[PDB]
Design a protein around this ligand. Structure first.
Ligand SMILES: Nc1ncnc2c1ncn2[C@@H]1O[C@H](COP(=O)(O)OP(=O)(O)O)[C@@H](O)[C@H]1O
Ligand code: BEF
Ligand SMILES: [Mg+2]
Length: 180
């Protein structure tokens, strides 16, 4: 549970606080816009995603957080038990779905399509907030199918607000400060 008020914009100058404050108005929800935070590990992607989610919850919007690998794996099981459609509603019903950590783990090519279904069903219905360390061109490798990746991104990116973050890891930052 992280909020915008604990985010140090001096330590992370690659993100414009103004743009983030625009997100916190939650305008993106009615505009059906997805929010994407991209960049290397530890730079505040998940922090910012959770901050927006926390604002949504406070403003009365149902919000759900899950990593990409967990989402794919859970939907796989639900499908094996002939209850795919029921698990799908869990990820489609929330007004704001945060799909965290897209791209560290290559997804089972046999299960990558579960992610497409969530994206396709939420498409032009309810926002997805996504964090990833990979460029869009690398998504083919993640899902094990360049064609499926293009289809996913076509929907995801159509109505979207993209943040490309940079900088040194805040994790290693805090580690230095202790040592020093
Ligand atoms: N500018 C920042 N200001 C305050 N805390 C930060 C900042 N960037 C990262 N953190 C914190 O460092 C840790 C790593 O940030 P995180 O967003 O989880 O990394 P990632 O970009 O890989 O998702 C978290 O605990 C986060 O709250
Ligand atoms: F390590 Be971060 F979640 F990309
Ligand atoms: Mg993260």
């Amino acid at each position: 549970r992280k909020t915008i008020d604990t985010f140090d914009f001096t330590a992370q100058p690659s993100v414009d606080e103004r743009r983030i404050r625009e997100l916190l108005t939650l305008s993106f929800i009615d505009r059906k816009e997805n929010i994407l935070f991209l960049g290397p590990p530890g730079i505040g992607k998940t922090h910012l995603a959770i901050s927006i989610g926390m604002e949504a919850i406070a403003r009365g919007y149902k919000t759900y957080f899950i990593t990409a690998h967990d989402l794919v794996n859970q939907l796989r099981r639900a499908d094996q038990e002939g209850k795919l459609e029921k698990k799908l509603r869990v990820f489609v019903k929330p007004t704001v779905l945060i799909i965290d950590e897209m791209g560290y783990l290559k997804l089972d090519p046999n299960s990558a399509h579960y992610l497409f279904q969530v994206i396709a069903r939420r498409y032009e219905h309810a926002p997805i907030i996504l964090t990833s360390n990979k460029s869009f061109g690398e998504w083919g490798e993640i899902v094990g199918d360049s064609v499926l990746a293009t289809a996913m991104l076509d929907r995801l990116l159509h109505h979207s607000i993209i943040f490309n973050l940079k900088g040194e890891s805040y994790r290693l930052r805090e580690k230095r400060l202790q040592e020093e």
